[PDB]
């Protein structure tokens, strides 16, 4: 009973899918667009803006964009992506379609498609809220290192992590669900963390339900019942370091086009996107609808 809204999805994606390197004018437009879109979908919207030095360009202005429904709730489901496009010396026009225009558009579209719930019955409660986090400056400028990467997430985590024996705001996040590298044909998602295996399993079972009911395109399994054997550093790392459980929805293998100019709209696979959206919007709905007591995946 949650239907597609591909018109909204396409429109949202078209607005995000422009070059948007930190420090650029195009980046500022996308930031403003994210704030406007969140306000328009019923979120209380805040920006975490700060200056920091990066290789080559020196001091730039970063801005994490955060939307919350039920800001007073005791606990939160946090869904996230990065909205910056990577700086490339040879490719100022990189649009990062899978990385992560599509992920950010998926967050907004999930809000839209579940809007009849989120903007009404979901407001009448204090146990759980919903956060959509658009991290800035995930991408390195020179080489990915512990200094040069995840600028925005590092900052937001430190902020949420900053009376003495009370819970820090970050401890109110039951799970950070981070989407990255989505939009290529036939993505495969494996479970990176034992403590969120239960949530990964729920995506597996929701996919099986939707498939069985004839609601998915094609016969490819997207959510696998397997543990990961790789390592993927990403915006979740600063949350993991503060003991926040993580579900890391990054396709492995990476899209063929990763970090090349061909990570563009022409190389997206719309059936895969639509299938991911179907599973994901139901996962989010079920998590929130079934939430009664504080969810404990830390201890
Ligand atoms: C949202 O955006 C996507 C991407 O532009 C739209 O997907 C496109 O949808 C059209 C119409 O269904 C597809 O046209 C088809 O072309 C194939 C041959 O390539 C042909 O077999 C069909 O008869 C039809 O003409 C098109 O392939 C498809 N493009 C991609 C890249 O998937 C989609 O319709 C948009 N949805 C909206 C605006 O609701
Ligand atoms: Zn990237």
């Amino acid at each position: 009973q949650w239907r597609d809204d591909e018109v909204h999805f396409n429109r949202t994606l078209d607005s995000i899918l422009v070059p948007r390197v930190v420090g650029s004018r195009g980046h500022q437009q996308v930031r403003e667009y994210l704030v406007q879109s969140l306000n328009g979908l019923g979120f209380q919207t805040e920006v975490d803006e700060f200056k920091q030095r990066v290789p080559v360009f020196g001091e730039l202005t970063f801005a994490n964009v955060v939307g919350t429904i039920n800001p007073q709730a005791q606990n939160f489901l946090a869904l996230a992506c990065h909205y910056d496009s990577k700086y490339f010396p040879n490719d100022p026009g990189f649009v990062g379609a899978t990385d992560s225009a599509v992920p950010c558009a998926i967050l907004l579209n999930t809000a839209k498609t579940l809007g009849a719930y989120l903007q009404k019955e979901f407001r009448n409660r204090s146990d759980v809220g919903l956060m959509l986090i658009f991290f800035d400056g995930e991408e390195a400028f020179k080489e990915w290192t512990d200094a040069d990467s995840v600028y925005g997430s590092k900052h937001l985590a430190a902020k949420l992590a900053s009376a003495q024996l009370a819970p820090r705001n970050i401890d109110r996040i039951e799970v950070l669900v981070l989407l990255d590298l989505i939009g290529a044909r036939n993505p495969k998602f494996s479970s990176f963390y034992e403590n969120t295996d239960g949530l990964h399993s729920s995506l597996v079972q929701i996919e099986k339900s939707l498939r069985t009911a004839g609601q998915l395109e094609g016969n490819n399994n997207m959510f696998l019942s397997r543990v990961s054997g790789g390592l993927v550093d990403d915006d979740h790392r600063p949350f993991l370091d503060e003991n926040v459980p993580v579900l890391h929805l990054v396709a492995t293998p990476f899209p063929d086009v990763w970090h090349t100019p061909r990570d563009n709209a022409a190389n997206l696979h719309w059936p895969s996107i639509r299938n991911f959206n179907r599973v994901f919007r139901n996962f989010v709905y079920q998590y929130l609808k079934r939430h009664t007591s504080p969810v404990n995946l830390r201890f």
Side-chain angles (χ1 to χ4, degrees):
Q1 102 266 31
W2 295 109
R3 302 185 77 243
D4 292 357
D5 187 346
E6 183 159 87
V7 161
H8 175 272
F9 179 79
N10 285 9
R11 176 172 175 178
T12 298
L13 182 60
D14 289 336
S15 282
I16 297 169
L17 194 70
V18 297
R20 50 192 190 283
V21 174
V22 175
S24 77
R25 305 175 74 184
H27 180 275
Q28 176 69 14
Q29 291 172 339
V30 177
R31 171 183 160 175
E32 290 173 8
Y33 172 84
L34 295 170
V35 170
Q36 148 194 322
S37 297
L38 287 163
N39 285 334
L41 286 152
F43 295 81
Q44 174 216 267
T45 302
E46 296 174 49
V47 170
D48 173 35
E49 182 174 64
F50 63 98
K51 295 183 184 176
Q52 188 164 348
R53 293 183 60 83
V54 307
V56 188
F57 297 105
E59 172 172 282
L60 304 175
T61 301
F62 294 83
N64 300 300
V65 182
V66 182
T68 311
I69 300 181
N70 308 335
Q72 268 35 77
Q74 180 176 97
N75 291 273
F76 296 90
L77 171 60
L79 308 183
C81 70
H82 84 87
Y83 81 94
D84 63 307
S85 63
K86 183 165 171 70
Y87 170 69
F88 286 101
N90 71 328
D91 187 22
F94 183 67
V95 297
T98 65
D99 183 13
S100 283
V102 165
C104 298
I106 288 171
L107 297 188
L108 295 169
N109 191 247
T110 299
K112 177 74 174 184
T113 63
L114 299 180
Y117 175 73
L118 295 179
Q119 298 184 252
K120 248 284 144 54
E121 174 192 337
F122 185 66
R123 294 197 188 277
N124 302 328
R125 77 198 292 182
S126 64
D127 56 321
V128 71
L130 177 64
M131 289 169 72
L132 275 34
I133 303 170
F134 301 81
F135 291 117
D136 203 10
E138 186 258 9
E139 302 276 15
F141 284 80
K142 281 267 168 88
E143 202 202 346
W144 185 284
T145 61
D146 194 68
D148 185 15
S149 59
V150 300
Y151 293 92
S153 175
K154 278 170 178 151
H155 195 264
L156 189 59
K159 185 181 206 209
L160 296 178
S162 79
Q164 19 271 307
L165 292 175
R168 313 168 294 166
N169 287 350
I170 214 177
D171 300 316
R172 294 190 183 283
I173 299 168
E174 298 172 333
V175 61
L176 176 73
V177 181
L178 182 57
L179 285 62
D180 195 358
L181 310 187
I182 300 163
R185 181 195 276 270
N186 292 342
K188 299 286 173 178
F189 298 95
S190 288
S191 188
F192 290 88
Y193 304 99
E194 185 174 46
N195 61 343
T196 55
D197 276 349
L199 302 170
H200 195 86
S201 285
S202 96
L203 293 157
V204 175
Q205 294 307 324
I206 289 167
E207 187 186 10
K208 282 173 182 184
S209 291
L210 292 178
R211 179 177 318 288
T212 300
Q215 301 189 344
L216 299 187
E217 300 159 68
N219 309 118
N220 284 285
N221 293 329
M222 175 169 303
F223 294 98
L224 305 179
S225 283
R226 293 182 183 174
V227 311
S228 48
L231 294 181
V232 184
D233 199 17
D234 208 343
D235 285 318
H236 64 295
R237 168 248 291 178
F239 288 71
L240 222 46
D241 290 344
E242 298 297 341
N243 204 40
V244 183
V246 171
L247 188 66
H248 196 183
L249 299 177
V250 55
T252 59
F254 286 7
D256 287 343
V257 298
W258 177 92
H259 284 190
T260 72
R262 295 178 51 259
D263 186 4
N264 60 22
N267 286 282
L268 298 176
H269 190 250
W270 256 265
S272 287
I273 295 178
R274 283 188 293 266
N275 287 346
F276 182 96
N277 275 327
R278 286 163 191 145
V279 181
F280 186 69
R281 87 172 62 102
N282 285 286
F283 166 83
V284 168
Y285 175 76
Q286 290 296 331
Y287 189 99
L288 296 170
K289 181 72 180 156
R290 297 175 177 255
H291 187 278
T292 57
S293 63
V295 178
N296 175 22
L297 305 170
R298 295 175 167 77
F299 300 118

PDB file of all heavy atoms in Angstrom, residues 147-178:
ATOM      1  N   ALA A 147      42.817  12.593   7.727  1.00  0.00           N
ATOM      2  CA  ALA A 147      42.547  14.017   7.681  1.00  0.00           C
ATOM      3  C   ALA A 147      41.533  14.351   6.545  1.00  0.00           C
ATOM      4  O   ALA A 147      40.519  15.002   6.777  1.00  0.00           O
ATOM      5  CB  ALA A 147      43.841  14.797   7.498  1.00  0.00           C
ATOM      6  N   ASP A 148      41.804  13.866   5.343  1.00  0.00           N
ATOM      7  CA  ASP A 148      41.137  14.346   4.154  1.00  0.00           C
ATOM      8  C   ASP A 148      40.016  13.415   3.662  1.00  0.00           C
ATOM      9  O   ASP A 148      40.207  12.639   2.753  1.00  0.00           O
ATOM     10  CB  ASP A 148      42.178  14.565   3.037  1.00  0.00           C
ATOM     11  CG  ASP A 148      41.601  15.191   1.759  1.00  0.00           C
ATOM     12  OD1 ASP A 148      40.466  15.754   1.727  1.00  0.00           O
ATOM     13  OD2 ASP A 148      42.357  15.125   0.765  1.00  0.00           O
ATOM     14  N   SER A 149      38.868  13.528   4.322  1.00  0.00           N
ATOM     15  CA  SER A 149      37.662  12.728   4.039  1.00  0.00           C
ATOM     16  C   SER A 149      36.642  13.009   5.154  1.00  0.00           C
ATOM     17  O   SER A 149      36.982  13.562   6.190  1.00  0.00           O
ATOM     18  CB  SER A 149      37.992  11.213   3.937  1.00  0.00           C
ATOM     19  OG  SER A 149      38.561  10.704   5.119  1.00  0.00           O
ATOM     20  N   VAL A 150      35.382  12.691   4.879  1.00  0.00           N
ATOM     21  CA  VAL A 150      34.313  12.700   5.877  1.00  0.00           C
ATOM     22  C   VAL A 150      34.304  13.946   6.782  1.00  0.00           C
ATOM     23  O   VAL A 150      34.032  13.866   8.002  1.00  0.00           O
ATOM     24  CB  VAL A 150      34.258  11.375   6.678  1.00  0.00           C
ATOM     25  CG1 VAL A 150      34.017  10.182   5.743  1.00  0.00           C
ATOM     26  CG2 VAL A 150      35.511  11.170   7.547  1.00  0.00           C
ATOM     27  N   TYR A 151      34.559  15.097   6.155  1.00  0.00           N
ATOM     28  CA  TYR A 151      34.646  16.387   6.879  1.00  0.00           C
ATOM     29  C   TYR A 151      33.348  16.673   7.630  1.00  0.00           C
ATOM     30  O   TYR A 151      33.323  16.917   8.827  1.00  0.00           O
ATOM     31  CB  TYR A 151      34.946  17.533   5.905  1.00  0.00           C
ATOM     32  CG  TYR A 151      36.309  17.471   5.260  1.00  0.00           C
ATOM     33  CD1 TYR A 151      36.506  16.840   4.047  1.00  0.00           C
ATOM     34  CD2 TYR A 151      37.392  18.066   5.869  1.00  0.00           C
ATOM     35  CE1 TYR A 151      37.744  16.786   3.454  1.00  0.00           C
ATOM     36  CE2 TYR A 151      38.642  18.018   5.299  1.00  0.00           C
ATOM     37  CZ  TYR A 151      38.819  17.389   4.088  1.00  0.00           C
ATOM     38  OH  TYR A 151      40.061  17.358   3.553  1.00  0.00           O
ATOM     39  N   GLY A 152      32.251  16.605   6.899  1.00  0.00           N
ATOM     40  CA  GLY A 152      30.941  16.928   7.457  1.00  0.00           C
ATOM     41  C   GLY A 152      30.474  15.979   8.553  1.00  0.00           C
ATOM     42  O   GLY A 152      29.998  16.431   9.585  1.00  0.00           O
ATOM     43  N   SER A 153      30.584  14.682   8.311  1.00  0.00           N
ATOM     44  CA  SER A 153      30.196  13.679   9.285  1.00  0.00           C
ATOM     45  C   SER A 153      31.026  13.791  10.576  1.00  0.00           C
ATOM     46  O   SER A 153      30.461  13.708  11.682  1.00  0.00           O
ATOM     47  CB  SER A 153      30.400  12.280   8.699  1.00  0.00           C
ATOM     48  OG  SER A 153      30.131  11.351   9.705  1.00  0.00           O
ATOM     49  N   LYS A 154      32.355  13.941  10.424  1.00  0.00           N
ATOM     50  CA  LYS A 154      33.233  14.152  11.592  1.00  0.00           C
ATOM     51  C   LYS A 154      32.689  15.286  12.415  1.00  0.00           C
ATOM     52  O   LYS A 154      32.463  15.135  13.605  1.00  0.00           O
ATOM     53  CB  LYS A 154      34.684  14.436  11.232  1.00  0.00           C
ATOM     54  CG  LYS A 154      35.529  13.224  10.940  1.00  0.00           C
ATOM     55  CD  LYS A 154      36.830  13.747  10.363  1.00  0.00           C
ATOM     56  CE  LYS A 154      37.829  12.684  10.045  1.00  0.00           C
ATOM     57  NZ  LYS A 154      38.659  13.206   8.909  1.00  0.00           N
ATOM     58  N   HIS A 155      32.378  16.388  11.763  1.00  0.00           N
ATOM     59  CA  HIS A 155      31.855  17.540  12.477  1.00  0.00           C
ATOM     60  C   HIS A 155      30.507  17.341  13.119  1.00  0.00           C
ATOM     61  O   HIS A 155      30.281  17.784  14.284  1.00  0.00           O
ATOM     62  CB  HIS A 155      31.784  18.708  11.534  1.00  0.00           C
ATOM     63  CG  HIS A 155      31.607  20.036  12.205  1.00  0.00           C
ATOM     64  ND1 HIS A 155      30.414  20.600  12.367  1.00  0.00           N
ATOM     65  CD2 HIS A 155      32.549  20.939  12.720  1.00  0.00           C
ATOM     66  CE1 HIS A 155      30.567  21.809  12.965  1.00  0.00           C
ATOM     67  NE2 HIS A 155      31.874  22.003  13.184  1.00  0.00           N
ATOM     68  N   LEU A 156      29.561  16.742  12.382  1.00  0.00           N
ATOM     69  CA  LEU A 156      28.212  16.496  12.935  1.00  0.00           C
ATOM     70  C   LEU A 156      28.240  15.527  14.103  1.00  0.00           C
ATOM     71  O   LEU A 156      27.506  15.724  15.056  1.00  0.00           O
ATOM     72  CB  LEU A 156      27.233  15.969  11.880  1.00  0.00           C
ATOM     73  CG  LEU A 156      25.758  15.884  12.300  1.00  0.00           C
ATOM     74  CD1 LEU A 156      25.301  17.278  12.697  1.00  0.00           C
ATOM     75  CD2 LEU A 156      24.844  15.362  11.190  1.00  0.00           C
ATOM     76  N   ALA A 157      29.027  14.457  13.986  1.00  0.00           N
ATOM     77  CA  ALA A 157      29.171  13.496  15.047  1.00  0.00           C
ATOM     78  C   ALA A 157      29.708  14.194  16.344  1.00  0.00           C
ATOM     79  O   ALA A 157      29.202  13.937  17.454  1.00  0.00           O
ATOM     80  CB  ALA A 157      30.093  12.355  14.646  1.00  0.00           C
ATOM     81  N   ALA A 158      30.701  15.085  16.180  1.00  0.00           N
ATOM     82  CA  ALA A 158      31.363  15.706  17.342  1.00  0.00           C
ATOM     83  C   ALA A 158      30.312  16.587  17.942  1.00  0.00           C
ATOM     84  O   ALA A 158      30.169  16.638  19.140  1.00  0.00           O
ATOM     85  CB  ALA A 158      32.618  16.510  16.946  1.00  0.00           C
ATOM     86  N   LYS A 159      29.500  17.219  17.106  1.00  0.00           N
ATOM     87  CA  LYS A 159      28.502  18.117  17.621  1.00  0.00           C
ATOM     88  C   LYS A 159      27.421  17.372  18.422  1.00  0.00           C
ATOM     89  O   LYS A 159      27.119  17.728  19.558  1.00  0.00           O
ATOM     90  CB  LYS A 159      27.864  18.878  16.487  1.00  0.00           C
ATOM     91  CG  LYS A 159      26.877  19.926  16.954  1.00  0.00           C
ATOM     92  CD  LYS A 159      26.243  20.652  15.787  1.00  0.00           C
ATOM     93  CE  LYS A 159      25.801  22.044  16.199  1.00  0.00           C
ATOM     94  NZ  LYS A 159      24.634  22.500  15.413  1.00  0.00           N
ATOM     95  N   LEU A 160      26.873  16.311  17.831  1.00  0.00           N
ATOM     96  CA  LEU A 160      25.838  15.508  18.479  1.00  0.00           C
ATOM     97  C   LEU A 160      26.380  14.812  19.717  1.00  0.00           C
ATOM     98  O   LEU A 160      25.607  14.521  20.615  1.00  0.00           O
ATOM     99  CB  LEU A 160      25.241  14.454  17.493  1.00  0.00           C
ATOM    100  CG  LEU A 160      24.492  15.047  16.284  1.00  0.00           C
ATOM    101  CD1 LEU A 160      23.976  13.970  15.317  1.00  0.00           C
ATOM    102  CD2 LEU A 160      23.356  15.981  16.677  1.00  0.00           C
ATOM    103  N   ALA A 161      27.677  14.514  19.731  1.00  0.00           N
ATOM    104  CA  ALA A 161      28.323  13.843  20.848  1.00  0.00           C
ATOM    105  C   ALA A 161      28.721  14.778  22.023  1.00  0.00           C
ATOM    106  O   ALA A 161      29.113  14.282  23.069  1.00  0.00           O
ATOM    107  CB  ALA A 161      29.540  13.071  20.392  1.00  0.00           C
ATOM    108  N   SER A 162      28.596  16.092  21.849  1.00  0.00           N
ATOM    109  CA  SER A 162      29.061  17.053  22.840  1.00  0.00           C
ATOM    110  C   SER A 162      27.955  17.360  23.828  1.00  0.00           C
ATOM    111  O   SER A 162      26.847  17.693  23.395  1.00  0.00           O
ATOM    112  CB  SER A 162      29.512  18.346  22.148  1.00  0.00           C
ATOM    113  OG  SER A 162      28.405  19.158  21.788  1.00  0.00           O
ATOM    114  N   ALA A 163      23.603  16.791  33.624  1.00  0.00           N
ATOM    115  CA  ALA A 163      24.136  16.805  32.267  1.00  0.00           C
ATOM    116  C   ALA A 163      25.194  15.707  32.052  1.00  0.00           C
ATOM    117  O   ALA A 163      25.109  14.932  31.087  1.00  0.00           O
ATOM    118  CB  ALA A 163      24.698  18.182  31.932  1.00  0.00           C
ATOM    119  N   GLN A 164      26.160  15.624  32.969  1.00  0.00           N
ATOM    120  CA  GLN A 164      27.335  14.718  32.836  1.00  0.00           C
ATOM    121  C   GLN A 164      27.023  13.223  32.581  1.00  0.00           C
ATOM    122  O   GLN A 164      27.805  12.515  31.933  1.00  0.00           O
ATOM    123  CB  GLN A 164      28.288  14.828  34.058  1.00  0.00           C
ATOM    124  CG  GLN A 164      27.713  15.431  35.348  1.00  0.00           C
ATOM    125  CD  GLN A 164      27.856  16.956  35.418  1.00  0.00           C
ATOM    126  OE1 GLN A 164      28.954  17.498  35.258  1.00  0.00           O
ATOM    127  NE2 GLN A 164      26.750  17.649  35.668  1.00  0.00           N
ATOM    128  N   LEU A 165      25.909  12.741  33.131  1.00  0.00           N
ATOM    129  CA  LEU A 165      25.560  11.323  33.055  1.00  0.00           C
ATOM    130  C   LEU A 165      24.342  11.079  32.147  1.00  0.00           C
ATOM    131  O   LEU A 165      23.902   9.934  31.979  1.00  0.00           O
ATOM    132  CB  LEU A 165      25.311  10.794  34.472  1.00  0.00           C
ATOM    133  CG  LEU A 165      26.520  10.718  35.415  1.00  0.00           C
ATOM    134  CD1 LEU A 165      26.095  10.286  36.809  1.00  0.00           C
ATOM    135  CD2 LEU A 165      27.588   9.766  34.880  1.00  0.00           C
ATOM    136  N   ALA A 166      23.809  12.171  31.595  1.00  0.00           N
ATOM    137  CA  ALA A 166      22.665  12.157  30.695  1.00  0.00           C
ATOM    138  C   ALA A 166      23.090  11.651  29.311  1.00  0.00           C
ATOM    139  O   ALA A 166      24.282  11.659  28.982  1.00  0.00           O
ATOM    140  CB  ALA A 166      22.081  13.566  30.566  1.00  0.00           C
ATOM    141  N   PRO A 167      22.117  11.203  28.507  1.00  0.00           N
ATOM    142  CA  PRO A 167      22.472  10.758  27.178  1.00  0.00           C
ATOM    143  C   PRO A 167      22.845  11.957  26.319  1.00  0.00           C
ATOM    144  O   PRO A 167      22.187  12.997  26.369  1.00  0.00           O
ATOM    145  CB  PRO A 167      21.187  10.107  26.670  1.00  0.00           C
ATOM    146  CG  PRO A 167      20.102  10.838  27.361  1.00  0.00           C
ATOM    147  CD  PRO A 167      20.654  11.207  28.710  1.00  0.00           C
ATOM    148  N   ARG A 168      23.916  11.790  25.558  1.00  0.00           N
ATOM    149  CA  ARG A 168      24.287  12.771  24.526  1.00  0.00           C
ATOM    150  C   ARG A 168      23.272  12.640  23.414  1.00  0.00           C
ATOM    151  O   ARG A 168      22.635  11.572  23.259  1.00  0.00           O
ATOM    152  CB  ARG A 168      25.674  12.465  24.008  1.00  0.00           C
ATOM    153  CG  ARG A 168      26.694  12.200  25.087  1.00  0.00           C
ATOM    154  CD  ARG A 168      27.965  11.624  24.533  1.00  0.00           C
ATOM    155  NE  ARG A 168      27.803  10.283  23.952  1.00  0.00           N
ATOM    156  CZ  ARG A 168      28.713   9.698  23.172  1.00  0.00           C
ATOM    157  NH1 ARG A 168      29.860  10.324  22.888  1.00  0.00           N
ATOM    158  NH2 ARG A 168      28.510   8.490  22.679  1.00  0.00           N
ATOM    159  N   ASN A 169      23.060  13.713  22.663  1.00  0.00           N
ATOM    160  CA  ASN A 169      22.124  13.655  21.540  1.00  0.00           C
ATOM    161  C   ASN A 169      22.468  12.500  20.607  1.00  0.00           C
ATOM    162  O   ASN A 169      21.587  11.784  20.212  1.00  0.00           O
ATOM    163  CB  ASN A 169      22.061  14.970  20.795  1.00  0.00           C
ATOM    164  CG  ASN A 169      21.331  16.035  21.576  1.00  0.00           C
ATOM    165  OD1 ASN A 169      20.724  15.755  22.581  1.00  0.00           O
ATOM    166  ND2 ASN A 169      21.362  17.250  21.095  1.00  0.00           N
ATOM    167  N   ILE A 170      23.747  12.253  20.345  1.00  0.00           N
ATOM    168  CA  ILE A 170      24.099  11.151  19.444  1.00  0.00           C
ATOM    169  C   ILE A 170      23.655   9.748  19.965  1.00  0.00           C
ATOM    170  O   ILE A 170      23.377   8.858  19.175  1.00  0.00           O
ATOM    171  CB  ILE A 170      25.602  11.146  19.117  1.00  0.00           C
ATOM    172  CG1 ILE A 170      25.870  10.642  17.654  1.00  0.00           C
ATOM    173  CG2 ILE A 170      26.392  10.344  20.131  1.00  0.00           C
ATOM    174  CD1 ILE A 170      27.356  10.697  17.282  1.00  0.00           C
ATOM    175  N   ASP A 171      23.597   9.572  21.289  1.00  0.00           N
ATOM    176  CA  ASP A 171      23.184   8.312  21.869  1.00  0.00           C
ATOM    177  C   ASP A 171      21.683   8.044  21.660  1.00  0.00           C
ATOM    178  O   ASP A 171      21.247   6.947  21.863  1.00  0.00           O
ATOM    179  CB  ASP A 171      23.515   8.254  23.395  1.00  0.00           C
ATOM    180  CG  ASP A 171      24.997   8.406  23.676  1.00  0.00           C
ATOM    181  OD1 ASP A 171      25.828   7.787  22.994  1.00  0.00           O
ATOM    182  OD2 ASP A 171      25.335   9.191  24.567  1.00  0.00           O
ATOM    183  N   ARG A 172      20.923   9.063  21.314  1.00  0.00           N
ATOM    184  CA  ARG A 172      19.546   8.911  20.935  1.00  0.00           C
ATOM    185  C   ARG A 172      19.310   8.299  19.511  1.00  0.00           C
ATOM    186  O   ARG A 172      18.159   8.023  19.141  1.00  0.00           O
ATOM    187  CB  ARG A 172      18.865  10.251  21.017  1.00  0.00           C
ATOM    188  CG  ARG A 172      18.774  10.779  22.443  1.00  0.00           C
ATOM    189  CD  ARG A 172      17.871  12.023  22.527  1.00  0.00           C
ATOM    190  NE  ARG A 172      17.879  12.528  23.897  1.00  0.00           N
ATOM    191  CZ  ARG A 172      17.203  11.988  24.916  1.00  0.00           C
ATOM    192  NH1 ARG A 172      16.404  10.931  24.773  1.00  0.00           N
ATOM    193  NH2 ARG A 172      17.319  12.514  26.113  1.00  0.00           N
ATOM    194  N   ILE A 173      20.390   8.102  18.741  1.00  0.00           N
ATOM    195  CA  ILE A 173      20.305   7.460  17.395  1.00  0.00           C
ATOM    196  C   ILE A 173      20.351   5.968  17.584  1.00  0.00           C
ATOM    197  O   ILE A 173      21.360   5.416  17.991  1.00  0.00           O
ATOM    198  CB  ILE A 173      21.417   7.967  16.404  1.00  0.00           C
ATOM    199  CG1 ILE A 173      21.267   9.480  16.194  1.00  0.00           C
ATOM    200  CG2 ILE A 173      21.313   7.242  15.040  1.00  0.00           C
ATOM    201  CD1 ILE A 173      22.431  10.166  15.497  1.00  0.00           C
ATOM    202  N   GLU A 174      19.225   5.307  17.326  1.00  0.00           N
ATOM    203  CA  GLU A 174      19.176   3.843  17.433  1.00  0.00           C
ATOM    204  C   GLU A 174      20.067   3.185  16.382  1.00  0.00           C
ATOM    205  O   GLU A 174      20.695   2.169  16.645  1.00  0.00           O
ATOM    206  CB  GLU A 174      17.738   3.317  17.317  1.00  0.00           C
ATOM    207  CG  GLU A 174      16.843   3.826  18.436  1.00  0.00           C
ATOM    208  CD  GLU A 174      15.345   3.506  18.281  1.00  0.00           C
ATOM    209  OE1 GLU A 174      14.857   3.337  17.154  1.00  0.00           O
ATOM    210  OE2 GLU A 174      14.646   3.476  19.338  1.00  0.00           O
ATOM    211  N   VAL A 175      20.120   3.790  15.186  1.00  0.00           N
ATOM    212  CA  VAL A 175      20.857   3.238  14.061  1.00  0.00           C
ATOM    213  C   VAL A 175      21.019   4.326  13.020  1.00  0.00           C
ATOM    214  O   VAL A 175      20.129   5.152  12.828  1.00  0.00           O
ATOM    215  CB  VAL A 175      20.203   1.970  13.444  1.00  0.00           C
ATOM    216  CG1 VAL A 175      18.793   2.251  12.897  1.00  0.00           C
ATOM    217  CG2 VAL A 175      21.133   1.389  12.362  1.00  0.00           C
ATOM    218  N   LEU A 176      22.222   4.404  12.447  1.00  0.00           N
ATOM    219  CA  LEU A 176      22.485   5.247  11.305  1.00  0.00           C
ATOM    220  C   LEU A 176      22.465   4.373  10.030  1.00  0.00           C
ATOM    221  O   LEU A 176      23.243   3.428   9.894  1.00  0.00           O
ATOM    222  CB  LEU A 176      23.829   5.965  11.449  1.00  0.00           C
ATOM    223  CG  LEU A 176      24.263   6.813  10.239  1.00  0.00           C
ATOM    224  CD1 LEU A 176      23.428   8.095  10.143  1.00  0.00           C
ATOM    225  CD2 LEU A 176      25.770   7.107  10.294  1.00  0.00           C
ATOM    226  N   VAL A 177      21.490   4.638   9.175  1.00  0.00           N
ATOM    227  CA  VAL A 177      21.338   3.883   7.944  1.00  0.00           C
ATOM    228  C   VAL A 177      21.920   4.776   6.847  1.00  0.00           C
ATOM    229  O   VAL A 177      21.309   5.791   6.459  1.00  0.00           O
ATOM    230  CB  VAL A 177      19.870   3.497   7.642  1.00  0.00           C
ATOM    231  CG1 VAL A 177      19.817   2.693   6.350  1.00  0.00           C
ATOM    232  CG2 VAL A 177      19.264   2.688   8.778  1.00  0.00           C
ATOM    233  N   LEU A 178      23.111   4.392   6.378  1.00  0.00           N
ATOM    234  CA  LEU A 178      23.870   5.199   5.433  1.00  0.00           C
ATOM    235  C   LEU A 178      23.765   4.568   4.045  1.00  0.00           C
ATOM    236  O   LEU A 178      24.196   3.441   3.848  1.00  0.00           O
ATOM    237  CB  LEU A 178      25.358   5.286   5.809  1.00  0.00           C
ATOM    238  CG  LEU A 178      26.275   6.159   4.894  1.00  0.00           C
ATOM    239  CD1 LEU A 178      25.812   7.608   4.756  1.00  0.00           C
ATOM    240  CD2 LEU A 178      27.740   6.083   5.388  1.00  0.00           C
TER     241      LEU A 178
END
